[PDB]
Design an enzyme around this catalytic site. Structure first.
Site, PDB file in Angstrom:
ATOM      1  N   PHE A 290     -11.243 -12.969  13.743  1.00 51.93           N
ATOM      2  CA  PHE A 290     -12.719 -13.112  13.782  1.00 51.93           C
ATOM      3  C   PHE A 290     -13.213 -14.574  13.675  1.00 51.93           C
ATOM      4  O   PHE A 290     -12.526 -15.424  13.099  1.00 51.93           O
ATOM      5  CB  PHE A 290     -13.397 -12.235  12.708  1.00 51.93           C
ATOM      6  CG  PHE A 290     -13.065 -12.631  11.299  1.00 51.93           C
ATOM      7  CD1 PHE A 290     -11.908 -12.153  10.681  1.00 51.93           C
ATOM      8  CD2 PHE A 290     -13.901 -13.491  10.590  1.00 51.93           C
ATOM      9  CE1 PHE A 290     -11.587 -12.526   9.385  1.00 51.93           C
ATOM     10  CE2 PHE A 290     -13.594 -13.866   9.285  1.00 51.93           C
ATOM     11  CZ  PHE A 290     -12.434 -13.385   8.679  1.00 51.93           C
ATOM     12  N   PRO A 291     -14.415 -14.867  14.219  1.00 56.96           N
ATOM     13  CA  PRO A 291     -14.954 -16.237  14.131  1.00 56.96           C
ATOM     14  C   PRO A 291     -15.537 -16.609  12.755  1.00 56.96           C
ATOM     15  O   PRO A 291     -16.101 -15.757  12.046  1.00 56.96           O
ATOM     16  CB  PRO A 291     -16.066 -16.258  15.195  1.00 56.96           C
ATOM     17  CG  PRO A 291     -15.862 -15.002  16.012  1.00 56.96           C
ATOM     18  CD  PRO A 291     -15.256 -14.011  15.076  1.00 56.96           C
ATOM     19  N   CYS A 292     -15.404 -17.885  12.403  1.00 53.36           N
ATOM     20  CA  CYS A 292     -15.975 -18.420  11.170  1.00 53.36           C
ATOM     21  C   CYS A 292     -17.501 -18.564  11.270  1.00 53.36           C
ATOM     22  O   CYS A 292     -18.013 -19.497  11.902  1.00 53.36           O
ATOM     23  CB  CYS A 292     -15.329 -19.768  10.831  1.00 53.36           C
ATOM     24  SG  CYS A 292     -15.635 -20.332   9.143  1.00 53.36           S
ATOM     25  N   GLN A 293     -18.210 -17.619  10.650  1.00 54.94           N
ATOM     26  CA  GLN A 293     -19.674 -17.633  10.563  1.00 54.94           C
ATOM     27  C   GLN A 293     -20.105 -17.650   9.093  1.00 54.94           C
ATOM     28  O   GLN A 293     -19.480 -16.990   8.256  1.00 54.94           O
ATOM     29  CB  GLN A 293     -20.293 -16.390  11.222  1.00 54.94           C
ATOM     30  CG  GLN A 293     -19.979 -16.150  12.700  1.00 54.94           C
ATOM     31  CD  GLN A 293     -20.386 -14.743  13.122  1.00 54.94           C
ATOM     32  OE1 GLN A 293     -19.736 -13.767  12.755  1.00 54.94           O
ATOM     33  NE2 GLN A 293     -21.484 -14.634  13.868  1.00 54.94           N
TER      34      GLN A 293
ATOM     35  N   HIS B  26     -15.328 -24.024   3.788  1.00 56.35           N
ATOM     36  CA  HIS B  26     -16.542 -23.658   4.518  1.00 56.35           C
ATOM     37  C   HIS B  26     -17.704 -23.274   3.593  1.00 56.35           C
ATOM     38  O   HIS B  26     -17.553 -22.436   2.706  1.00 56.35           O
ATOM     39  CB  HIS B  26     -16.215 -22.511   5.485  1.00 56.35           C
ATOM     40  CG  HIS B  26     -17.286 -22.221   6.494  1.00 56.35           C
ATOM     41  ND1 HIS B  26     -18.332 -21.358   6.245  1.00 56.35           N
ATOM     42  CD2 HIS B  26     -17.448 -22.645   7.772  1.00 56.35           C
ATOM     43  CE1 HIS B  26     -19.099 -21.272   7.317  1.00 56.35           C
ATOM     44  NE2 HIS B  26     -18.584 -22.041   8.259  1.00 56.35           N
TER      45      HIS B  26
END
Length: 414
Positions: A154-157, A193
């Site tokens: 999955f993408p880093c959001q 993050h």
């Protein structure tokens, strides 16, 4: 009737132009797009040749050791390792239509036992506020079958806490299906993050789902969840790997990603070993591109014959960025860049297939990996991929645990 069946499968993967070219290459008949379409609505060696363009099922087919799904699947980077330990992929989600083509070219997918989805929200209904959590879960189960291992990149959001993100969709799916295990891949810096907020929320969410994550409390600079492809292949490429075990199954025991070092190859593949000694001329930089790339390099050059290229590891900083020397003389370039003689020695780019080897989709010396898309799309695909042998190693570490999990449910059925 089987000829029409092959063609429909082929047209999901290859351009008509390529299939027509391939049919003409057999040298028996003259083919065109229109004639190909006619045949879709003629045989012999042409049929046999077209067969070589499709992946075969594994040798143990139709009997598999376990079931898995592939979310944000890309071109099958995470899938390869688990298919290697006898896994059956029963569902794949991947939004990128060109990535799906490369995926289909290299992974056998039986529509009787497997499904593709493009947009995952169509299954989770996360964009539909009026749908209850339970109704969404029931809806997810219509589309995504029971499985033992869930795989996701999955993408880093940045961030009920996870809502408004693709991570949420993954969480909805884990909750609806309760796989025995999952493997999630993410960016190396996940811990940093958003001042640590993203990693904290992800780990807490996974714990609250009832999963024990490998090495969950080992979060220093030596974090075993960070695994670099450099151990397997000659490039720095780190991802964080989150391996979860469903707590009620008591499968985790002493599992740790520290054990990954047991999976490192005896001798590492060198940069030199990945290169084709003969490459098409179109890979040589154009004079203009070399002007661009040269000034950039001044404001990654490989010398395949220089003994160092046996040793060196390409940084994190291919068929654009990574260049292969063809005997450019630095001093001559400084004096007279357009020197016609030195201009015969412009460097070349890696080819898509050499990029495949760099990422682990293709063994040194081999050309088994099918690339049904343009060089541009292929570079993007390999650039976006996980390092294959990292996830093959993870699968190998998990194999006994996966066998235990399948044994448990098979006995839980009695």
């Amino acid at each position: 009737n089987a000829a029409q069946a092959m063609l429909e499968k082929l047209l999901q993967i290859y351009d008509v132009k390529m299939l027509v070219a391939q049919l003409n290459g057999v040298g028996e008949n003259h083919w065109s797009a229109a004639i190909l379409k006619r045949a879709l609505a003629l045989s012999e060696k042409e049929f046999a040749h077209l067969q070589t363009l499709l992946p075969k099922p594994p040798e143990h087919h139709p009997h598999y050791a376990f079931r898995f799904i592939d979310l944000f699947a890309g071109i099958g980077g995470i899938r390869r390792g688990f298919e290697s330990i006898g896994g059956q992929c029963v569902f794949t989600s991947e939004w990128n239509k060109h990535a799906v083509r490369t995926y289909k070219a290299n992974h056998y997918c039986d529509p009787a036992t497997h499904h593709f989805n493009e947009d995952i929200r169509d299954i989770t209904l996360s964009h539909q506020e009026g749908v209850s959590d339970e109704a969404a879960a029931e809806h997810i189960r219509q589309h995504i079958p029971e499985h033992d291992v869930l795989l996701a990149g999955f993408p880093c959001q940045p961030f009920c806490d996870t809502q408004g993100t693709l991570f949420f969709d993954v969480v909805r799916i884990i909750d609806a299906r309760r796989p025995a295990m999952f493997v999630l891949e993410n960016v190396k810096n996940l811990k940093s993050h958003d001042k640590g907020k993203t990693f904290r929320i992800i780990m807490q969410t996974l714990d609250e789902l009832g999963y024990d994550v490998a090495d969950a409390e080992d979060n220093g600079p030596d974090d075993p969840k960070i695994i670099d492809g450099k151990h397997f292949l000659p490039q720095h490429r780190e991802r964080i790997v989150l391996v979860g075990f469903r707590r009620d199954l008591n499968l985790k025991a002493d599992f740790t990603l520290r054990d990954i070092s047991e999976c490192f190859p005896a001798q590492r593949v060198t940069l030199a070993q990945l290169l084709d000694p003969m490459v098409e001329a179109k890979y040589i930089l154009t004079p203009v591109l070399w002007k661009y790339l040269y000034r950039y390099a001044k404001k990654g050059m490989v010398y395949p014959n220089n003994p160092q290229s046996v040793t060196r590891t390409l940084s994190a900083r291919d068929g654009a960025e990574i260049l292969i020397d063809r005997g450019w003389d630095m001093a001559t370039g400084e004096k007279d860049f357009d020197d016609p003689l030195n201009q015969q020695h412009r460097p070349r780019r890696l080819t898509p297939r050499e990029c495949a080897r760099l990422m682990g989709f293709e063994a040194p010396g081999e050309a088994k990996f099918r690339i049904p898309v343009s060089d541009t799309q292929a570079y993007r695909q390999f650039g976006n991929s996980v390092v294959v042998p990292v996830f093959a190693a993870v699968a190998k570490l998990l194999e006994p645990k996966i066998k235990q999990a399948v044994a448990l449910r098979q006995q839980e059925a009695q």
